[PDB]
Design a binder for this molecule. Structure first.
Ligand code: NA
Length: 123
């Protein structure tokens, strides 16, 4: 809104979170989340449209404006020493480089590496 400050980043869900309580933020992998309270280490408050609630912070990944987000469509074991990464189908990742050689650099939230573009879909 115009009352809030302009935002150059957001977050995307990495996993399914099932609400424990009426005020937990239900979400599926890939949904865009605006974090409105991250002052508590173990439980953040976020919004998905008009939905608002609490959720575990390790269930989301940070995305900068202009970064592309993908879902893995095919599990694939990468050659780690040359910079590739192993990912499983339905995993959510953030793009961190330009495509080259049929691979693109992505971030899982804990590891970085090259993954085949044919085994990703944009979300
Ligand atoms: Na920002």
């Amino acid at each position: 809104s115009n009352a809030g400050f302009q935002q150059s980043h957001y977050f995307v869900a990495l996993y399914r979170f099932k609400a424990l309580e009426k005020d937990d933020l239900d979400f599926r992998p890939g949904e865009k989340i605006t974090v409105i309270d991250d002052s508590n280490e173990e439980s953040w408050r976020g919004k998905i449209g008009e939905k608002v609630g609490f959720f575990p912070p390790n269930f989301i990944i940070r995305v900068r404006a202009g970064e592309r987000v993908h879902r893995v469509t095919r599990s694939f074991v990468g050659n780690r020493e040359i910079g590739q990464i192993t990912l499983k189908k339905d995993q959510i990742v953030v793009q961190k480089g330009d495509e080259a050689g049929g691979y693109v650099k992505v971030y899982t939230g804990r590891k970085v590496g090259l993954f085949p573009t044919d085994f990703l879909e944009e979300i």
